[PDB]
Design an enzyme around this catalytic site. Structure first.
Site, PDB file in Angstrom:
ATOM      1  N   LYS A 110      38.297  36.927  37.102  1.00  0.00           N
ATOM      2  CA  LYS A 110      38.061  38.317  37.406  1.00  0.00           C
ATOM      3  C   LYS A 110      37.753  39.107  36.159  1.00  0.00           C
ATOM      4  CE  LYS A 110      41.608  37.894  40.923  1.00  0.00           C
ATOM      5  NZ  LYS A 110      42.688  37.189  40.235  1.00  0.00           N
ATOM      6  N   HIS A 117      37.545  42.871  39.440  1.00  0.00           N
ATOM      7  CA  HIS A 117      38.992  42.879  39.738  1.00  0.00           C
ATOM      8  C   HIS A 117      39.445  44.100  40.528  1.00  0.00           C
ATOM      9  CE1 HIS A 117      42.950  41.072  37.956  1.00  0.00           C
ATOM     10  NE2 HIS A 117      43.206  41.635  39.127  1.00  0.00           N
ATOM     11  N   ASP A 142      43.549  30.657  41.090  1.00  0.00           N
ATOM     12  CA  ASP A 142      43.118  32.075  40.925  1.00  0.00           C
ATOM     13  C   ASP A 142      43.623  32.582  39.602  1.00  0.00           C
ATOM     14  OD1 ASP A 142      42.107  34.611  42.326  1.00  0.00           O
ATOM     15  OD2 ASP A 142      44.067  35.235  41.466  1.00  0.00           O
ATOM     16  N   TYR A 149      45.727  38.594  33.269  1.00  0.00           N
ATOM     17  CA  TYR A 149      46.958  37.842  33.383  1.00  0.00           C
ATOM     18  C   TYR A 149      47.413  37.219  32.042  1.00  0.00           C
ATOM     19  CZ  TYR A 149      45.710  38.173  38.368  1.00  0.00           C
ATOM     20  OH  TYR A 149      45.277  38.632  39.579  1.00  0.00           O
TER      21      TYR A 149
HETATM   22  N1  LIG Z   1      43.093  40.807  42.896  1.00  0.00           N
HETATM   23  C1  LIG Z   1      44.229  41.418  42.526  1.00  0.00           C
HETATM   24  O1  LIG Z   1      44.209  42.611  42.231  1.00  0.00           O
HETATM   25  C2  LIG Z   1      45.549  40.705  42.647  1.00  0.00           C
HETATM   26  C3  LIG Z   1      46.729  41.439  42.734  1.00  0.00           C
HETATM   27  C4  LIG Z   1      47.911  40.743  42.980  1.00  0.00           C
HETATM   28  C5  LIG Z   1      47.879  39.364  43.070  1.00  0.00           C
HETATM   29  N2  LIG Z   1      46.757  38.651  42.908  1.00  0.00           N
HETATM   30  C6  LIG Z   1      46.733  37.186  42.940  1.00  0.00           C
HETATM   31  O2  LIG Z   1      47.506  36.695  44.034  1.00  0.00           O
HETATM   32  C7  LIG Z   1      48.554  35.867  43.523  1.00  0.00           C
HETATM   33  C8  LIG Z   1      49.790  35.881  44.399  1.00  0.00           C
HETATM   34  O3  LIG Z   1      50.309  37.202  44.431  1.00  0.00           O
HETATM   35  P1  LIG Z   1      51.641  37.568  43.596  1.00  0.00           P
HETATM   36  O4  LIG Z   1      51.680  36.806  42.304  1.00  0.00           O
HETATM   37  O5  LIG Z   1      51.680  39.065  43.525  1.00  0.00           O
HETATM   38  O6  LIG Z   1      52.878  37.228  44.558  1.00  0.00           O
HETATM   39  P2  LIG Z   1      53.293  36.121  45.683  1.00  0.00           P
HETATM   40  O7  LIG Z   1      52.494  34.889  45.544  1.00  0.00           O
HETATM   41  O8  LIG Z   1      53.341  36.957  46.933  1.00  0.00           O
HETATM   42  O9  LIG Z   1      54.794  35.921  45.186  1.00  0.00           O
HETATM   43  C9  LIG Z   1      55.091  35.252  43.965  1.00  0.00           C
HETATM   44  C10 LIG Z   1      56.606  35.329  43.789  1.00  0.00           C
HETATM   45  O10 LIG Z   1      57.204  34.539  44.840  1.00  0.00           O
HETATM   46  C11 LIG Z   1      57.978  33.474  44.312  1.00  0.00           C
HETATM   47  N3  LIG Z   1      57.829  32.265  45.157  1.00  0.00           N
HETATM   48  C12 LIG Z   1      56.711  31.517  45.262  1.00  0.00           C
HETATM   49  N4  LIG Z   1      56.861  30.497  46.144  1.00  0.00           N
HETATM   50  C13 LIG Z   1      58.102  30.644  46.644  1.00  0.00           C
HETATM   51  C14 LIG Z   1      58.932  29.871  47.585  1.00  0.00           C
HETATM   52  N5  LIG Z   1      58.357  28.810  48.180  1.00  0.00           N
HETATM   53  N6  LIG Z   1      60.187  30.324  47.814  1.00  0.00           N
HETATM   54  C15 LIG Z   1      60.735  31.377  47.194  1.00  0.00           C
HETATM   55  N7  LIG Z   1      60.040  32.118  46.301  1.00  0.00           N
HETATM   56  C16 LIG Z   1      58.762  31.782  45.989  1.00  0.00           C
HETATM   57  C17 LIG Z   1      57.485  33.289  42.891  1.00  0.00           C
HETATM   58  O11 LIG Z   1      58.518  32.789  42.047  1.00  0.00           O
HETATM   59  P3  LIG Z   1      58.280  31.745  40.848  1.00  0.00           P
HETATM   60  O12 LIG Z   1      56.896  31.942  40.294  1.00  0.00           O
HETATM   61  O13 LIG Z   1      59.412  32.091  39.898  1.00  0.00           O
HETATM   62  O14 LIG Z   1      58.529  30.392  41.508  1.00  0.00           O
HETATM   63  C18 LIG Z   1      57.132  34.725  42.496  1.00  0.00           C
HETATM   64  O15 LIG Z   1      58.343  35.433  42.187  1.00  0.00           O
HETATM   65  C19 LIG Z   1      48.757  36.337  42.099  1.00  0.00           C
HETATM   66  O16 LIG Z   1      49.525  35.452  41.271  1.00  0.00           O
HETATM   67  C20 LIG Z   1      47.322  36.546  41.677  1.00  0.00           C
HETATM   68  O17 LIG Z   1      46.710  35.287  41.359  1.00  0.00           O
HETATM   69  C21 LIG Z   1      45.604  39.310  42.724  1.00  0.00           C
HETATM   70  C1  LIG Z   2      53.596  46.145  31.750  1.00  0.00           C
HETATM   71  C2  LIG Z   2      52.474  46.872  32.448  1.00  0.00           C
HETATM   72  C3  LIG Z   2      51.875  47.964  31.822  1.00  0.00           C
HETATM   73  C4  LIG Z   2      50.847  48.659  32.457  1.00  0.00           C
HETATM   74  C5  LIG Z   2      50.421  48.253  33.716  1.00  0.00           C
HETATM   75  C6  LIG Z   2      51.007  47.147  34.329  1.00  0.00           C
HETATM   76  N1  LIG Z   2      50.549  46.796  35.651  1.00  0.00           N
HETATM   77  C7  LIG Z   2      49.881  45.559  35.985  1.00  0.00           C
HETATM   78  C8  LIG Z   2      49.659  44.510  35.097  1.00  0.00           C
HETATM   79  C9  LIG Z   2      48.971  43.400  35.568  1.00  0.00           C
HETATM   80 CL1  LIG Z   2      48.671  42.003  34.456  1.00  0.00          CL
HETATM   81  N2  LIG Z   2      48.554  43.346  36.860  1.00  0.00           N
HETATM   82  C10 LIG Z   2      48.813  44.362  37.720  1.00  0.00           C
HETATM   83  S1  LIG Z   2      48.363  44.386  39.392  1.00  0.00           S
HETATM   84  C11 LIG Z   2      47.847  42.712  39.479  1.00  0.00           C
HETATM   85  C12 LIG Z   2      46.346  42.579  39.393  1.00  0.00           C
HETATM   86  O1  LIG Z   2      45.661  43.597  39.126  1.00  0.00           O
HETATM   87  O2  LIG Z   2      45.839  41.450  39.578  1.00  0.00           O
HETATM   88  N3  LIG Z   2      49.444  45.458  37.255  1.00  0.00           N
HETATM   89  C13 LIG Z   2      52.054  46.474  33.713  1.00  0.00           C
HETATM   90  C14 LIG Z   2      52.729  45.294  34.373  1.00  0.00           C
END
Ligand SMILES: NC(=O)c1ccc[n+]([C@@H]2O[C@H](COP(=O)([O-])OP(=O)(O)OC[C@H]3O[C@@H](n4cnc5c(N)ncnc54)[C@H](OP(=O)(O)O)[C@@H]3O)[C@@H](O)[C@H]2O)c1
Ligand SMILES: Cc1cccc(Nc2cc(Cl)nc(SCC(=O)O)n2)c1C
Length: 316
Positions: free
Chosen positions: A78, A111, A44, A49
């Protein structure tokens, strides 16, 4: 547990993908390479990003190494909010394809439903700290997304952070050519999304659960915030299944027929997160995790609460 879910376009989407938000450019190449080696077949991505070039480098290395073929990977990206204007969508998609070094995307998502003023700033702010909207609407942006499917640049299109009324607006659009395949939404035991999931699944729309671990790296985290990974109730479920808390959190949405996209840049955690096809949460475990709901969002887009298309005023 099938490892893939059928989309309304006929394609099969892997139920486990690697997230890449907050994966720094110098770490994400190795992260994606480890992920593909371990067995992930879904990544994803997003223009916002700011790491798609480095994701591209990794995918290309693994294709050249013949670890995978392109048709075996499911790559999502996205359209960012500053590219909602109908005439900018194609350019945005092409910049993403160029960064990822790909000829097509498997899935391209709007997005957020909120259009932002075009320009260099990802989050163009007014003096009050609220985002400056674009003069755009969701339906015209959708029509531009559909043209990408017609041109073969993307195999499927979808949405992210859309409430059920906003999905309904697309589904009822006059002259609709393609239904959304996926709605990617925040989902975890503190934000269980029962109504929106029910709604989407009833329309044949696959739901992808983001922030499944509660996004402990999110930059706005506060000490008083709840922490899924530290929740002793979830640790006890993990202990019962000789798994980690993270693995419980990943398996949870899988058993709800959701796709899930945990993010890591740590090779050991990338591997850990993939070891979720060797166990099953019980009916009681699922009921218990669902009961932890607290309507708590990692991603509430608080700078856009006055935007006409802000998604989270509605119940779901
Ligand atoms: N559509 C949208 O608006 C939107 C918004 C938010 C997220 N997303 C997508 O969803 C993805 C996942 O969400 P997220 O990045 O917010 O958070 P997440 O996957 O809920 O959490 C990531 C965090 O958890 C840590 N982590 C991962 N595996 C772990 C494990 N096995 N044990 C302990 N800690 C662990 C990671 O650390 P390290 O990386 O340091 O290992 C990082 O700090 C995003 O990266 C993005 O691709 C999309
Ligand atoms: C440093 C800064 C300035 C202004 C807005 C934001 N908030 C962000 C930035 C990004 Cl890359 N993503 C998000 S929510 C994750 C998502 O929309 O996928 N929120 C951030 C992290």
């Amino acid at each position: 547990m099938a490892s893939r879910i059928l989309l309304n376009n006929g394609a099969k989407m892997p139920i486990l993908g690697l997230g890449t938000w907050k994966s720094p450019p110098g770490q994400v190449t190795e992260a994606v390479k480890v992920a593909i080696d371990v067995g992930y077949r879904h990544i994803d991505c997003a223009h916002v990003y700011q790491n798609e070039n480095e994701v591209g480098v990794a995918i290309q290395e693994k294709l050249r190494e013949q670890v995978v073929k392109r048709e075996e990977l499911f790559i999502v990206s996205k359209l960012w909010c500053t590219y909602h204007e109908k005439g900018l969508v194609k350019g945005a998609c092409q910049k993403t394809l160029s960064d990822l070094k790909l000829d097509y995307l498997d899935l391209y998502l709007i997005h957020w439903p909120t259009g932002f003023k075009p320009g260099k700033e990802f989050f163009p702010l007014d003096e009050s700290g609220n985002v400056v909207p674009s003069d755009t609407n969701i339906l015209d942006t959708w029509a531009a997304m559909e043209e990408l499917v017609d041109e073969g640049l993307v195999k499927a299109i979808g949405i992210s952070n859309f409430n059920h009324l906003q999905v309904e607006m697309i589904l009822n659009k006059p002259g609709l050519k393609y239904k959304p395949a996926v709605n990617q939404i925040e989902c975890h035991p503190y934000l269980t999304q029962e109504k929106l999931i029910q709604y989407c699944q009833s329309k044949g729309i696959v739901v992808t659960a983001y922030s499944p671990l509660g996004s402990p790296d999110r930059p706005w985290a506060k000490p008083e915030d709840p922490s899924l990974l530290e929740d002793p109730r979830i640790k006890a479920i993990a202990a019962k299944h000789n798994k980690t808390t993270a693995q419980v959190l990943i398996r949870f949405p899988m058993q709800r027929n959701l796709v899930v996209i945990p993010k890591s840049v740590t090779p050991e955690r990338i591997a850990e997160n993939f070891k979720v096809f060797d166990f099953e949460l019980s009916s009681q475990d699922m009921t218990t995790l669902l009961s932890y709901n607290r309507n708590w969002r990692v991603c509430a887009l608080l700078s856009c609460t006055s935007h006409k298309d802000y998604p989270f005023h509605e119940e779901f």
